[PDB]
Amino acid sequence: SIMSYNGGAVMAMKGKNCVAIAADRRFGIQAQMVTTDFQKIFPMGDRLYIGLAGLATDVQTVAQRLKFRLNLYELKEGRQIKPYTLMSMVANLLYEKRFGPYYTEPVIAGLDPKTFKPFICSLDLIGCPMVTDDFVVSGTCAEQMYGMCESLWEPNMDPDHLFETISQAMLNAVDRDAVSGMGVIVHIIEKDKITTRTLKARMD
Amino acid sequence: YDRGVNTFSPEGRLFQVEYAIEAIKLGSTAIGIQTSEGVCLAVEKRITSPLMEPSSIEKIVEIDAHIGCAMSGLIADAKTLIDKARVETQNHWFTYNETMTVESVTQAVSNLALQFGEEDADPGAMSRPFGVALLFGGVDEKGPQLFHMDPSGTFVQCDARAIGSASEGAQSSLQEVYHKSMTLKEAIKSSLIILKQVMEEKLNATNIELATVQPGQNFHMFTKEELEEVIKDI
Amino acid sequence: LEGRTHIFKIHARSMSVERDIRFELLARLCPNSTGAEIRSVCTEAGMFAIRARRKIATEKDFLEAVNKVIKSYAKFSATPRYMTYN
Amino acid sequence: IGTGYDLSASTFSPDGRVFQVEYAMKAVENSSTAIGIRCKDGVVFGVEKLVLSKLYEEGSNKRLFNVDRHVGMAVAGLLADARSLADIAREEASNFRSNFGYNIPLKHLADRVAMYVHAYTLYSAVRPFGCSFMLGSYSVNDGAQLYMIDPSGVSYGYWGCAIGKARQAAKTEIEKLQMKEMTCRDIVKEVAKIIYIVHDEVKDKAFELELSWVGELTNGRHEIVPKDIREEAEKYAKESLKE
Amino acid sequence: AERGYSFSLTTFSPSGKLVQIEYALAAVAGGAPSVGIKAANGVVLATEKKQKSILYDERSVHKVEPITKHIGLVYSGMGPDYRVLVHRARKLAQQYYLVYQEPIPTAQLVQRVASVMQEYTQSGGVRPFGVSLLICGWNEGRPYLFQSDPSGAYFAWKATAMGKNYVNGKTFLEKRYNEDLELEDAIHTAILTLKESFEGQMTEDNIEVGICNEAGFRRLTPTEVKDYLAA
Amino acid sequence: NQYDNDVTVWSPQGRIHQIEYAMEAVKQGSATVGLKSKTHAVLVALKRAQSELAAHQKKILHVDNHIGISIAGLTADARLLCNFMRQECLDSRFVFDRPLPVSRLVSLIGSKTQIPTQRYGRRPYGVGLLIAGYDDMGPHIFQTCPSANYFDCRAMSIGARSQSARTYLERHMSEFMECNLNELVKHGLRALRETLPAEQDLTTKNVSIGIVGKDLEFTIYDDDDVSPFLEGLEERPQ
Amino acid sequence: SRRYDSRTTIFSPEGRLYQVEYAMEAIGHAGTCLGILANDGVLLAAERRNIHKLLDEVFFSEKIYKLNEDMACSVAGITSDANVLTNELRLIAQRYLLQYQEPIPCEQLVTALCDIKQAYTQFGGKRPFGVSLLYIGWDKHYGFQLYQSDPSGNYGGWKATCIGNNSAAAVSMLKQDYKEGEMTLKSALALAIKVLNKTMDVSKLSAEKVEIATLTRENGKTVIRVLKQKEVEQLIKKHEEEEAKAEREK
Amino acid sequence: SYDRAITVFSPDGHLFQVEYAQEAVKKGSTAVGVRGRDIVVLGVEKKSVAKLQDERTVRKICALDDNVCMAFAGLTADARIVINRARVECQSHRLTVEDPVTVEYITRYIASLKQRYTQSNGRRPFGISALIVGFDFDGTPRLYQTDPSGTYHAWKANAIGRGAKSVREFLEKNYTDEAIETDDLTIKLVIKALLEVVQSGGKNIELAVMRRDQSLKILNPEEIEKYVAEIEKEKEENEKKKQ
Amino acid sequence: SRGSSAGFDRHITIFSPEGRLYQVEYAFKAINQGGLTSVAVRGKDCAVIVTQKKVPDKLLDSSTVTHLFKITENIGCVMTGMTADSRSQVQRARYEAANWKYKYGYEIPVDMLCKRIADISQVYTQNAEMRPLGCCMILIGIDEEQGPQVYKCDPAGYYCGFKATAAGVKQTESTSFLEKKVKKKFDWTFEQTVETAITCLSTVLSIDFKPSEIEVGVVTVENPKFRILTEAEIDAHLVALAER
């Protein structure tokens, strides 16, 4: 498959007044790993992150064009972008190439810059949006992540429990996927701060 | 009063073309002589200062090994035509594996004559005629030929012709001295003589340029020494 | 060509000019200037010729005048705008 | 009124006129006369074709055109323009055939060509056509039809019509015919007659008569009048001129 | 056959003025007057929809037009030009909505419309629009009132007037109007400032009113305008 | 003076002055004469030279095996139209494998030249043509003006001082239809003669002859090839 | 068409472009706008022409456009043309960012816009943009910068300059008061309030009449801030309390 | 797009827009260049010393490649355009041909570009003149000059801009094989020539030099002051101790 | 001001110093050049059009002289002004209607047709290359819910709905008449409408028509297909006027 060419995994998860987004760190070409610190999660504002799995070229290029459009948006209007609006903007960008699509399945996680109400969502490679109140996943180990997140996720979690949950889910899902891993990075964002942690993971 | 670049005068003429002909009168004078031994081309360089390197004045160029060209008027406008001529000769060699006849090249360059005009055209098409007169001097299967061209696009074969500011004088002088059995030596000599007559500043080796095309020898631009050897016999 | 020579010769015929210098050359450098301007030259040299201290003018005296009048006073001319009768 | 208000077709005069179109019309007025008249069994065309030199061939500068196999055209004015309009009419008829399957109805061809003419009276980028023309046709499903088009783009249906120098005079001569009951056969003579009347032998030199049929006598095909009928009508005319 | 004139018809005078723009503004300041008031909890637009007779059906054309569900428009100046700008503004609004799936902010629609107006002061072969626009909107809790002029420049107002006698209307607004006004009071002072010029018995079909609160933009019915015209 | 500079501008008296002025460009060209028998079509042209040390302008051009032309006016426009006509003829032979009828070629030239008389900033073609041809309807001589009008002539002349030639031709039309080729070329040469002062006359240096016919492809005679026609002419002292 | 063409992209017989000159005249009649460079920042201060009792104040500014995370500009002339140019500036800067993944150097941004204005002077037959700009910014190559561009597409770098009405007075005053290498944000703010106070037709000067923006470097990030009216009143009061102090000495 | 002839012929056969362009050049800051043996020096006059102005941002001497620099006079924006285009072409030459760039080649490119703008619809001549200066491979030093017409020539020494006639006269009288025998002497000649038009300063002279396969060197006003000092000294040790 | 001009403001469609568009006004003047007058009246259950039918010569097929045009089977129009321009505008209207039905799948309303035509002419008003059309269109038709409708569009870009209107030479007078006769409040039946329109035109021209001097278009709620009355039925309406 094309999506399995580089592999990779991205997950986002809701909490109470907080939200979390994690990804593995491997940049690998099929079986071979080239680097272990590859960025898959891009800040699109304070308190709004986008998570991109898939083909690493389109990861980088979708991230970049999204930052393009976003900067323009935040300059024309005098405000950071709302998450819904970011979602629709990504959707538009992906659907523009409906007949030669970017091979990325983005995940968005962020707090409404006016309120604090957490938002998570994911999109197709052609930009079909999908919002949930629990979690969203993307990548080569989607099944795994679904399996962990259905069994670990509780509703009103505090930042520490959101952390423990998304961490265990990512770790155990990713450790049963051959082309995902080489480290896990987890961004738990709340109204007051943003915590970024890198977990101890297997390197095989 | 504004009119177009493609307007006719009641006397039946295009004002841009006529004005261009007027623009030639200001150019440096040039002489071409056709001869059964070859064709010669001279032009006076019109250096404005001893500080100006005269070797960077070329009003005589090689279109191809058997075709040379002497130009008068707006040189910058001449460069475009000369390039188009070179490309044309080479395309004909590419395609048919034989050199261009001087008349064919001349014709080709003459097609870019009246190719000017405003609306109803490409965004990179010409706005006005070429303010230049040319003398093409070549050798082909019909032997030594010399053609003259003006911004009207009319080109015509000539035995001996002059273009430039001292066109009239030099042409009369040429008529007085030309016959269809001159040697190339007499032709060059005559040319340098008439040139000295019409030139403002004194004729010398770094003041004119001179070139011949003979049937057995490719286009030859005369060096300083080769010029000196001729100017010596004033 | 032949005209201006008559214009030059007529105009300068009445003053102390250098007999070596041939108005023909000057006339050549005068494509389309009326016979009036040609007059600013003939008298123009007068200044130059007087500006040093000389009786008779030289070729350059005219040349300069030609380049001094014609060219310099070209922006004005109005002989090219009045040709098309504007 | 000529104060810049008459240099372009994109310019109205302060009284609400377009003077270029009027001047084009005036170009038509200065042209030789051509008439056309509709009867009950077709349409007949007549043209006063002035000979400008004996060096011109018989049948040079025809001012009768075959626009389609069922439609003839008679022009007056600047002849270039008339030819171009003939080509346009032809192509309109052709395209019609190819796209809809049948011969173009005359009212529709007239509407199309006249919209094409009108299209040139709006902009500064082109000039109005200096010609007026007549279109004649006959069909069993529509009848006999005759339209005229002027430089403004106006198209009208006529029983009888004339264009050029002697427009009025010709009309006055035409109103004396009872063409709504006459046959094409008969009409030819009257057309030639009206032409001979209208012609001014003093101002205009010698002339040649052009004549065109289109009707039930030709099975709907627009044709030239045979030399026989033509000479017959000419004779009738010359003799009717002595009265 | 046809192309397009490629050169600007709007050019700098030696004084540095774009003369055509000021003459377009002269065309604005000759149209029927219109007043716009932003009032804490809403926005009011009103204009003089005075016909020429009893034959024109006033229930057929309107001057207070909706652009979307939350933004409204009135004009002063030339009618046809207004029509064009309204079509174009609706189109722009819908582009924005296709892309962001969020109704266009009033400021952004004003920006876009203004850009359109500026194009016709620099593109070839055209005159500028002879219209001033008043654009009302509800976005982000707050109310919004902008004006765009034929130059393509735009300004945010608490209240303003355009058209004939716009200066006196403007002064009257400066005096007889201030903040903490409820939409109702704003409608009142709007019809009040329109009456400072209406030469006639201001009827319920002689003027057109629109409101914009945080329930959406809408045109007031002739009935509602009659009720409001009953004081 | 405001109706003078644009072809898109009708004059208040029903005329287009750029077209007329364009027509005047035909009279600036050296004279040329074209006449037909019943079997042959002949162009005779007076060539002209700039200075004595320059060759004479060529005035008869070859279009197709059955069609040749004589030009009068702007040479650039002449060559433009000439290339167009040659292209059309080649297109005709390419697609239909039959020579293009002269009347159709002429119609194409009318169509082509009409276009720029209707669009702003375009100018009419400043060249007049005489077209000599032979097809299934026999010999033809046609005349084309910058006005994009054309005429089917029985004989014609255009250019400067061509009215003389026109008169002469107008006098001997009745002879032409039965003439033989030598006599036809002679008549053309006489017509061309009557377009000169008594001081100057025909030569093998300033005359060009062009013939096409039922048994003869279009051919141009320029120099010594002309001499057998000229040396057979009785001079004229009037 | 030949008749109606005003011919905007054409030389005048003295060798000048009339529409460019006239555009400069238009600029002369716009709100004063000046900019002062310092060692710890750079600032723009502009006269507000939008000063009427009914204006609602819905934007962060009136004459100060934010173009890029490191860079900002002020304008003088026709405001709509300024909207056009500012949009295009945004686009340029974001394109550079998309291509190089690092912020555009200020000089390249200025050149990129100036090439557009020049283009308008050389061909197309359109009127030029009746706009001058001041650009303030920071980059990793030349640090704090101030630039200026005119409608001819011609630009230049300054340590302090002014643009708009009474530009020349302001320039002279700055030639007097500037302090090469010895400039601070505080001192520059004082200078701004001074020159603004003298150049503005309406004396006394309220915060309702001026707009101040500073661009400074704080902890590796670039900060661009428009001064709140309170701080501005503090500056004005400081100016008057310094002016009434130096008048005692006589 | 805009397709109008801006540059056309005048009835006396001149291109008036080109002449006005050349006027625009004549209003430029003075720029001169002289060619030495192992050094080529170009100096430009009034830097418009506004003192609040960053000199770096207003330099009128740019570099086209490591081999070629260029100075100019005229309309700075037009100069910027021409300079950038020339740079692109200098690089594309290295792409298409492994050999570098010769000063004549880039001169030819620039010239052709200007001429192109003198003969295209819609466009207006660039109102600049350039002094192109460089060292070709083989080591011969070269200085050419271009013009708003598109014409170009090589010079030993030349001047453009305000008071170019004065500087040109001076250079005509002072360019010898004795002068420009050392770098220090060629630079001296240029400063001597520039001081004959400048506002009498030294802070109003920029001088740039190129030498061998080394890069462009622009002079700091300290070195410039030193050279003008040795100048004034020799102007008082060979002109004072005599007259 | 008050009639001031500067530059080309009287030659092309740009602003005069007092903010007028002189070429548009001139187009309005161009409407009257036809020398005809048309009257349109809206009934309770119908809409009627009536227009002079000047056939000056018997040499013309009087059937081909018509200013009534079928835009759609259920939408009628009457044109006033320059003839060829009128036909141009008619073709455009036809196209816009057909296209509307093709894209939207219901019959075009007169309101939107008129708005579309108007919108097109505004472009002529705003672009310099072309000149407005010297014509005026009045459209009639029955809408699905608003009842009968009469609309009208101008050469500048203005369009409006009416209870009654007229165009051409005697426009002002016909409007005076009609605005007098609308205030009287009568049961606007079909014959009441037809008689009202005919008499408006007749009194305005002081003629008393033959049935071959006018032409009457109509559209009814009971029969929405735009119907052009034969000379016979016209006369039937004429003789009924010389009774009361």
Swiss-Prot record, chain C:
The modification N6-acetyllysine is found at K75. Disulfide bonds: none annotated. Induction: Expression is not cell cycle-dependent and occurs throughout the cell cycle. Monoubiquitinated by RNF181. Phosphorylated. Dephosphorylated by UBLCP1 which impairs PSMC2 ATPase activity and disrupts 26S proteasome assembly. It is found in: Cytoplasm. Component of the 26S proteasome, a multiprotein complex involved in the ATP-dependent degradation of ubiquitinated proteins. This complex plays a key role in the maintenance of protein homeostasis by removing misfolded or damaged proteins, which could impair cellular functions, and by removing proteins whose functions are no longer required. Therefore, the proteasome participates in numerous cellular processes, including cell cycle progression, apoptosis, or DNA damage repair. Belongs to the AAA ATPase family. Component of the 19S proteasome regulatory particle complex. The 26S proteasome consists of a 20S core particle (CP) and two 19S regulatory subunits (RP). The regulatory particle is made of a lid composed of 9 subunits, a base containing 6 ATPases including PSMC2 and few additional components. Interacts with NDC80/HEC; this interaction is detected only during M phase. Interacts and SQSTM1. Interacts with PAAF1. Directly interacts with TRIM5. (Microbial infection) Interacts with HIV-1 Tat.
Curated annotation (Swiss-Prot), chain E:
Pfam families: Proteasome (PF00227), Proteasome_A_N (PF10584). Induction: Down-regulated by antioxidants BO-653 and probucol. Down-regulated in response to enterovirus 71 (EV71) infection (at protein level). GO terms for biological process: proteasome-mediated ubiquitin-dependent protein catabolic process; response to virus. It comes from the Eukaryota. The modification Phosphoserine is found at S6, S13, S15. The modification Phosphotyrosine is found at Y5, Y23, Y75, Y120. The modification N6-acetyllysine is found at K69, K170. Keywords: Acetylation, Cytoplasm, Nucleus, Phosphoprotein, Proteasome. The keyword Membrane does not apply. Phosphorylated on tyrosine residues; which may be important for nuclear import. The modification N-acetylalanine is found at A1. The keyword Phosphoprotein applies. It is found in: Cytoplasm; Nucleus. GO terms for cellular component: cytoplasm; cytosol; extracellular exosome; extracellular region; ficolin-1-rich granule lumen; nucleoplasm; nucleus; P-body. Component of the 20S core proteasome complex involved in the proteolytic degradation of most intracellular proteins. This complex plays numerous essential roles within the cell by associating with different regulatory particles. Associated with two 19S regulatory particles, forms the 26S proteasome and thus participates in the ATP-dependent degradation of ubiquitinated proteins. Belongs to the peptidase T1A family. NCBIfam families: PRK03996.1. This is Proteasome subunit alpha type-2. It comes from Homo sapiens (Human).
UniProtKB/Swiss-Prot annotation, chain G:
It is found in: Cytoplasm; Nucleus. The modification Phosphoserine is found at S12, S74, S172. The modification N6-acetyllysine is found at K126, K175. It holds the Pfam family Proteasome. Its main location: cytoplasm. GO terms for cellular component: cytoplasm; cytosol; extracellular exosome; intracellular membrane-bounded organelle; nucleoplasm; nucleus; P-body; proteasome complex. The keyword rRNA processing does not apply. Keywords: Acetylation, Cytoplasm, Host-virus interaction, Nucleus, Phosphoprotein, Proteasome. The 26S proteasome consists of a 20S proteasome core and two 19S regulatory subunits. The 20S proteasome core is a barrel-shaped complex made of 28 subunits that are arranged in four stacked rings. The two outer rings are each formed by seven alpha subunits, and the two inner rings are formed by seven beta subunits. The proteolytic activity is exerted by three beta-subunits PSMB5, PSMB6 and PSMB7. (Microbial infection) Interaction with HTLV-1 TAX protein favors NFKB1 activation. NCBIfam families: PRK03996.1. Belongs to the peptidase T1A family. Component of the 20S core proteasome complex involved in the proteolytic degradation of most intracellular proteins. This complex plays numerous essential roles within the cell by associating with different regulatory particles. Associated with two 19S regulatory particles, forms the 26S proteasome and thus participates in the ATP-dependent degradation of ubiquitinated proteins. This is Proteasome subunit alpha type-4.
Swiss-Prot record, chain H:
Its main location: cytoplasm. The modification N6-acetyllysine is found at K226. Pfam families: Proteasome, Proteasome_A_N. One of its GO terms (cellular component) is cytosol. Changing Y152F: Displays impaired G1/S transition and S/G2 progression. PROSITE patterns: PROTEASOME_ALPHA_1, PROTEASOME_ALPHA_2. InterPro entries: Ntn_hydrolases_N, Proteasome_alpha, Proteasome_alpha-type, Proteasome_asu_N, Proteasome_sua/b. Disulfide bonds: none annotated. Coiled coil: none annotated. One of its GO terms (biological process) is proteasome-mediated ubiquitin-dependent protein catabolic process. Keywords: Acetylation, Cytoplasm, Glycoprotein, Host-virus interaction, Nucleus, Phosphoprotein, Proteasome. Gene3D superfamilies: Glutamine Phosphoribosylpyrophosphate, subunit 1, domain 1. NCBIfam families: PRK03996.1. Component of the 20S core proteasome complex involved in the proteolytic degradation of most intracellular proteins. This complex plays numerous essential roles within the cell by associating with different regulatory particles. Associated with two 19S regulatory particles, forms the 26S proteasome and thus participates in the ATP-dependent degradation of ubiquitinated proteins. Belongs to the peptidase T1A family. This is Proteasome subunit alpha type-7. The gene is PSMA7.
